[PDB]
Design a protein around this nucleic acid. Structure first.
Lengths: 233, 621, 656
RNA sequence: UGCU
RNA sequence: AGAGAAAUCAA
């Protein structure tokens, strides 16, 4: 497949252009993955960046330059309205593509609109914060075994016997069934982020007046407070 | 560090990284032993072919994924630490090179893989000798005997033996030269071992004195503080304009206007009105940015740094001395109460138009109802209009303060009522700003509409008379250089509504908690120390004054205000404790008011807060 | 101020958040830090003795002092050695499980620490270019320097990095050849390792005077990292520590404990005066040595724990640009020593542009270790109360029987902190005898309720990047503020509305704009919040992505849904983003010898990111260099392909 | 050149 | 000029 020759040519280019850089140790990756001379925050410049005449940088593609006096292509940089042009009079994709491009978001939304809420009643409750699991997970996976579960899900061949041993079985297969369509449509970084978010059991400090299940702990900024408490299903 | 002469350079380079040798006990020896094992593996696996494939493939000192690939094809798997050094395809068995000083202890290590025990002097174990060919035994013997004279040449004997005996141990080594450097600025060694006998001396201390009376903050004396905020605030007004864009309103105003000075200040010469008129014309012809006129030099202080430096150099006289900076002491101005009263005045418009969020749960309805009622409480107020004016002015000033233009930019302060009529709050005038740092100040010429004129409150503002269709309004004009960070933080002045909203929300929710039903219409009686005595007042008015005072504390924020508030929080806590009939005790040299009094210099609202504190009872008993 | 003190239906402590300056410019520091740093340096020498004797006090190597030398009235700088031994022994004897975790950390977790985490730090002064640089750049500079000087490859572990730092110091001469070669001596390298870069602390609130912050060099940051990880491991298991893990339950639990009615309660809330400039590094050396000795730890562990503080005792704090001198109206910038000033005592400590300082410390370093020094002091038989310590701020709980014995315990607490160099501020510590009213860090306590009050208002603005990600960021920040108790129903909803309005304005969608006027002229109805449509989120919906909500409620319908989420869109083709890749997930359009190095590192990162799918899930742990690892992985991935062997060797023939 |  | 607050901006 052309991907193999692409990797070979990129390897040859990296070796030719960067002699000393390739000679660094492989374990140094965790060091030079963040090598950048860039540092407050774009929040202080976004208002002017959006109003720049050509804010959006767009890769060459099939976009009309002038529509109803649009001047939206300079051949690169694009116009601020081309995302809205890509919402009407554009190109569509398959229904499966849009169904699989977001899965964890759908799971979070459906759990919101699936629970009946009782009558909110007020009192002098004093809420005390305990560390509880942030969001519900597809299966109970220990924090230590999450990297190995992800390793089995994404790259089974680049693993080791004990990596398989200290990986929670069962959740790997369900993660595979749910991430097979997601992997092919999104990038690998996005795929691994979504998968870990599906399996991560991160204990976060949340307000607590009664014992919280992960389902209840996911939505806790409005269920209980110092002056109100509504009881779930 | 140097490579042994009996080991090939490739093996040494491969060993360089395979394990961390420098932080292990007896380094440069475990590495040599592992190189010996790898060389043994190479010699056993040297140019031997079986079934058209190499007879021995070494599962050692190479990338792991290759081992898993080869083992997967062979229907076998090995974990990390009992990894065989080599595997034989002819017999489908795995081996590990494991040197032993003694040959009598056969000691089968594990049943997963067999072992190839070769002693240092050369002879092989009976099993490993009978399972391998003669040439392999001979050349392994040669390599081991060569390693033997290498060892005896530099007497590596005992530490090689203990390397063979057991697993590596981690060590950290500090040299003798670094140790002398480390001890230059201390009396103890690297590991401190003082000879003193552990004990806790009984030091004689002082007593704890009770705060029987609350401290009284020192009211400063001097000239009354002027109004030093960026904009007029409570004394701000707007001019109603016909509906349209900003350029249309500016054109209308410029076409129907007459300018005449009523009060000219030395700080802001009256000759800079030409710049304002020129910018009005420019922004009315469709060019927000205009060229530079002669009066712009005075208006924006062009080349003021160089000429002042030249004047200082010419007037230099005396001797160099340490810099002494003086902050002039000022008293509480009488206009703070006037601003408090005016900012609470009721307006006709809501002045707070924030889009309602969605509602899905019963909880969301409560929050939205509370927010809407809070907006109703503090919306039809002058302070809300001033907040909107500050938001618009700061945003329009900041959006044009991103490049390094050397020409004047116009940033009108124009708001639109629900009907559509434009409202001329004022104007902001950017000067040449070659800004490089967020701290650097950008020259501005603030032109805006007064409601009343007071020379003592505005000693630096120039006052002009404006005639706009038989209606007269005052017109401020002040030269001000104002920084980028301050403009950015004032562009989000709407955040000040949170604290009064917090207080109102907590009061309403406390009512909701005391009963068993939300009301959203409760307006209880809040008791306060007003004019010395204790008189109550309603929640809606209380929240309304809180918003005005917080707005003043926000537009007047400096090291003095933050220090005053930070050091006054504990005195507020102490007052609450004495309210709850509780005793407040202090250590020996405790003067809590001294930490607050140092922050009261010239800030008008710090002085106003100090007066409010002093107008309160000192003892509660 | 009388308006902030209600007398009915609501407590003055409940209105405590009105005494803050969230909205309003945070003060920025101007000009030189030289006066501030010289003032910070002179304090330990001023209060070392009962009477100011700075000139004679500039001869003390170890801050040990006699008990009668301790100033019970004013600040006291220095420690009592035997007191430190006894207090450390007492702190070891109790909380033994906490010290057991330290043993496991040393034996198991410490050897597995990598030096790659040193790249996740603050700006670090680089001794090569003599300028502040980002942490990864300085880290790789130092690693390359050690490799060129030690003729060996530095191991991935942090212990290997510290060992390399140790062995590089015995070399008489060190070089950094590579167009650009600069020499160093043992003394020069030692001075660079000792040098502490100082800079103004900006955007700080709650102070009238500006302070300065000092940062370590990469030659000592590994040792500091080891010591601070050990300190965090200890503090995470002791009940008396108010570190980020302790501040949640400790204060709330202490505010809820019942007390016998006949007993006498009490809370001491206060700040430690001159905390940074009073502690001596030898006290921490001694405490750490006692801790390691009573664990039976080996001697190299003791040396590793002691090197950081010993280097600190030899610190060369950078003065800065010099002191400000006036000749009337004009001003000049002059170093310390050229002209007389109020710091003429410290002229003898001037080394180049740096200054020697043995006594005292600097802020921004050894934050967690300083907390430990404040908790061994609490370990006394007289002190039977409850203490919580967090850097320079503390709260203490007294449970006594008589007021006189309570005052005796309070004085014992005041003096025992003085035995290690910790002076609580007399004007900042307040004791409430009857019941519970106090403050700690940012929390404010009244009766059974503890209310966290923020120091900085959440930035209710988009954080840049793209609308989809920063909408989620803003909602998450508001949710975090609500969860901490700072906000509630109405405050949270109002913050949401303010952020939403600033969000709609920040992407040019409010009012009559070019984008807006484009939508209604091309019949582009608005469907998203960034487009100006009605907001889909609510108070109970801060954790949900916009597009999923709009699909569930039937807003984005189906035809527009396909088009906006098409993966092949022209516009397109990281910690808690939780946003879908769509068309609105776009990006905006924004010493010189380093840029090409950045690009080379980025390309090598890109090739590794694709050939190794396991390098994102975990950390890169494989012996060998980048070249051999990539080549072997290429060979392995080609040989496992479905292609026949002839194509396999055809592909392998072009690899070089 | 249009944030209540 | 002015902003400002322990010293800078007014390239």
């Amino acid at each position: 497949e052309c991907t193999l020759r692409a990797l070979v040519e990129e390897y040859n280019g990296a070796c030719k252009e960067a002699p000393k850089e390739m000679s660094k140790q492989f374990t140094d990756y965790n060091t030079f993955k963040r090598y950048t001379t860039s540092k407050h925050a774009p929040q202080m410049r976004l208002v002017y960046s959006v109003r720049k005449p050509w804010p959006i940088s767009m890769t060459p593609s099939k976009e009309i330059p002038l529509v109803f006096n649009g001047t939206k292509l300079k051949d690169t940089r694009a116009n601020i309205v081309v995302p809205d042009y890509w919402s009407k009079y554009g190109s569509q994709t398959s229904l499966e593509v849009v169904n699989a491009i977001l899965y964890a978001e759908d799971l979070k939304v459906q759990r919101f609109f699936s629970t009946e809420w009782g009558e909110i009643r007020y009192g002098r409750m004093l809420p005390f914060r305990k560390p509880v699991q942030a969001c519900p997970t597809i299966e109970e996976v220990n924090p230590a075994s999450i990297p190995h579960t992800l390793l089995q899900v994404f790259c089974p061949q680049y693993t080791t016997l004990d990596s398989k041993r200290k990986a929670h079985m069962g959740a790997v297969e369900k993660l595979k069934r749910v991430m097979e369509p997601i992997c092919k449509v999104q990038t690998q970084e996005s795929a691994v982020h979504i998968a870990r978010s599906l399996i991560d059991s991160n204990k976060k400090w949340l307000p607590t007046v009664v014992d919280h299940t992960p389902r209840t702990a996911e939505m806790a900024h409005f269920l209980c407070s110092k002056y109100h408490y509504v009881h779930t299903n | 560090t140097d490579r042994p002469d009996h080991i090939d350079s490739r093996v040494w380079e491969l060993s360089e990284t395979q394990e961390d040798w420098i932080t292990q006990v007896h380094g440069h020896v475990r590495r040599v032993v592992e190189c010996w094992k790898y060389t043994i593996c190479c010699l056993i696996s040297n140019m031997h072919t079986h079934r058209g494939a190499p007879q021995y493939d070494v599962f050692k000192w190479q990338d792991r994924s290759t081992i898993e690939w080869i083992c997967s094809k062979k229907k076998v798997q090995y974990p990390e630490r009992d990894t065989p050094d080599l595997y034989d395809n002819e017999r489908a068995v795995a081996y590990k090179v494991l040197l032993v000083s003694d040959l009598s202890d056969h000691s089968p290590t594990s049943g997963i893989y067999h072992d190839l025990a070769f002693n240092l002097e050369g002879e092989a174990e009976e099993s490993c000798a009978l399972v391998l060919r003669g040439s392999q035994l001979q050349d392994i013997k040669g390599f081991l005997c060569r390693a033997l004279e290498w060892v005896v040449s530099n007497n590596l004997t005992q530490e090689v033996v203990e390397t063979i005996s057991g697993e590596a141990k981690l060590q950290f080594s500090v040299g003798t030269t670094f140790r002398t450097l480390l001890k230059r600025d201390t009396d103890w060694d690297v590991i401190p071992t003082p000879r003193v006998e552990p004990n806790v001396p009984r030091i004689e201390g002082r007593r704890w004195t009770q705060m029987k009376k609350l401290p009284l903050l020192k009211e400063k004396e001097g000239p009354p503080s002027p109004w030093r905020a960026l904009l007029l605030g409570a004394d701000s007004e707007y001019i109603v304009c016909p509906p349209g864009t900003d350029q249309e309103a500016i054109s209308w105003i410029h076409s129907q206007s007459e300018i005449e000075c009523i009060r000219e200040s030395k700080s802001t010469p009256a000759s800079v009105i030409t710049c304002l008129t020129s910018s009005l014309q420019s922004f009315a012809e469709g060019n927000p940015v205009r060229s530079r006129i002669h009066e712009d030099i005075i208006a924006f202080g062009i080349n003021k740094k160089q000429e002042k430096k030249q004047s200082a150099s010419s007037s230099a006289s005396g001797e160099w001395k340490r810099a002494e900076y003086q902050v002039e002491e000022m008293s509480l101005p009488p206009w703070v109460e006037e601003e408090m009263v005016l900012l609470r005045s009721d307006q006709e418009d809501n002045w707070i138009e924030l889009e309602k969020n969605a509602i899905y749960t019963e909880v969301d309805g409560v929050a939205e109802g509370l927010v809407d009622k809070y907006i109703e409480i503090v919306g039809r107020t002058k302070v809300a209009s001033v907040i909107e004016k500050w938001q618009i002015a700061a945003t329009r000033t900041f959006s044009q303060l991103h490049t390094d233009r050397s020409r004047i930019t116009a940033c009108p302060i124009i708001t639109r009522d629900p009907s559509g009529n434009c409202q001329f709050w004022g104007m902001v005038l950017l000067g040449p700003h070659h800004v490089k740092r967020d701290t650097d100040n950008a020259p501005l010429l603030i032109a805006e509409i007064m409601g009343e004129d007071t020379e003592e409150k505005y000693p630096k503002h120039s006052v002009f008379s404006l005639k706009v269709e038989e209606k007269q309004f005052l017109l401020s004009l002040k030269i001000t250089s104002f920084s980028r960070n301050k403009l950015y933080t004032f562009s989000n002045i709407r955040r000040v509504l949170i604290q009064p909203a917090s207080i109102y929300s907590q009061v309403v929710l406390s009512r909701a908690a005391e009963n068993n039903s939300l009301n959203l219409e409760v307006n209880p009686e809040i008791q306060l120390y007003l004019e010395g005595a204790q008189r109550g007042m309603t929640l809606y008015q209380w929240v309304r004054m809180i918003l005005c005072l917080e707005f003043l504390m926000a537009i007047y924020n400096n090291p003095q205000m933050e220090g005053f508030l930070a050091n006054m929080r504990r005195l507020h806590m102490s007052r609450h404790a004495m309210m709850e009939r509780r005793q407040v005790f202090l250590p020996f040299g405790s003067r809590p008011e001294d930490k607050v009094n140092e922050c009261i210099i010239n800030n008008p609202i710090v002085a106003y807060l100090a007066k409010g504190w002093n107008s309160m009872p000192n003892v509660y008993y | 101020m009388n308006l902030f003190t209600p007398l009915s239906e609501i407590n003055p402590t409940t209105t405590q958040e009105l005494l803050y300056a969230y909205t309003g410019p945070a003060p920025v520091a101007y000009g030189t830090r030289t006066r501030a740093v010289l003032e910070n340096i002179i304090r330990p020498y001023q209060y070392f003795y009962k009477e100011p004797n700075v000139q004679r006090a500039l001869d003390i190597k170890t801050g040990c002092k006699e008990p009668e030398d301790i100033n019970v009235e004013g600040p006291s700088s220095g420690f009592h050695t035997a007191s430190v031994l006894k207090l450390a022994d007492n702190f070891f004897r109790k909380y033994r499980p906490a010290m057991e975790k330290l043993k496991y950390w040393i034996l198991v977790k410490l050897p597995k620490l990598k030096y790659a985490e040193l790249s996740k730090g603050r700006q670090t002064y680089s001794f090569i270019h003599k300028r502040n640089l980002p942490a990864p750049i300085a880290l790789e500079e130092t690693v390359e320097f050690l490799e060129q000087n030690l003729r060996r490859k530095i191991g991935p572990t942090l212990l290997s990095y510290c060992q390399a730092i140790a062995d590089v110091m015995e070399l008489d001469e060190t070089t950094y050849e590579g167009t650009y070669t600069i020499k160093f001596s043992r003394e020069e390298l030692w001075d660079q390792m000792r040098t502490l870069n100082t800079m103004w602390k900006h955007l700080e609130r709650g102070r009238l005077n500006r302070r300065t912050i000092a940062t370590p060099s990469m030659l000592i940051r590994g040792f500091v990292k080891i010591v601070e990880d050990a300190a965090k491991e200890i503090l995470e298991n002791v009940p008396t520590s108010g570190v980020p893990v302790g501040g949640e339950e400790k204060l709330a639990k202490l505010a809820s404990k019942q007390t016998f009615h006949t007993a006498v309660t009490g809370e001491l809330s206060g700040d430690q005066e001159k905390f940074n400039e009073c502690l001596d590094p030898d006290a921490m050396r001694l405490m750490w040595t006692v801790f390691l000795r009573k664990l039976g730890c080996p001697d190299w562990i003791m040396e590793l724990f002691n090197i950081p503080f010993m280097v600190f005792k030899s610190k060369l704090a950078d003065m800065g640009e010099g002191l400000v001198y006036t000749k009337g109206k004009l001003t000049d910038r002059k170093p310390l020593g050229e002209m007389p000033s109020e710091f003429d005592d410290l002229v003898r400590n001037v080394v180049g542009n740096s200054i020697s300082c043995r006594l005292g410390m600097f802020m921004g370093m050894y934050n967690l270790t300083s907390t430990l020094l404040a908790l061994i002091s609490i370990e006394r038989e007289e002190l039977t109360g409850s203490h919580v310590e967090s850097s320079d701020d503390f709260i203490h709980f007294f449970n006594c029987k008589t007021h006189e014995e309570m005052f005796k315990q309070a004085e014992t607490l005041r003096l025992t902190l003085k035995l290690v160099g910790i002076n609580m501020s007399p004007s900042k510590c307040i004791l409430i005898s009857p019941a519970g009213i106090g403050e700690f860090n940012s929390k404010f306590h009244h009766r059974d309720f503890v209310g966290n009050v923020a120091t900085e208002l959440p930035a209710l603005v988009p954080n840049g990047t793209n609308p989809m990600t920063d909408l989620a960021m803003g909602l998450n920040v508001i949710k975090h503020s609500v969860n901490t108790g700072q906000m509630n129903l109405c405050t949270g909803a109002l913050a949401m509305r303010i952020f939403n309005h600033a969000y709609k304005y920040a992407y040019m969608a409010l009012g009559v704009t070019r984008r807006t006027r484009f939508m209604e002229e091309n019949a582009i109805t608005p469907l998203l919040t960034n487009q100006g449509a009605s907001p889909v989120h609510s108070f109970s919906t801060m954790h949900l992505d916009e597009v999923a909500l709009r699909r569930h409620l039937g807003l984005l319908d189906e035809e527009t849904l396909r088009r906006i989420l098409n993966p092949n869109n022209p516009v397109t083709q990281i910690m808690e983003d939780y946003s879908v890749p769509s068309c609105f997930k776009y990006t905006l359009s924004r010493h010189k010898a380093l840029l090409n190095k950045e690009e080379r590192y980025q390309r090598v990162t890109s090739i590794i990111n694709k050939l190794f799918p396991e390098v994102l899930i975990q950390e890169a742990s494989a012996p060998g260099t980048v070249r051999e690892s990539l080549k072997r992985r290429l060979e392995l991935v080609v040989e496992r392909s479905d292609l026949d062997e002839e194509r396999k060797k055809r592909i392998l023939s072009r690899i070089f």
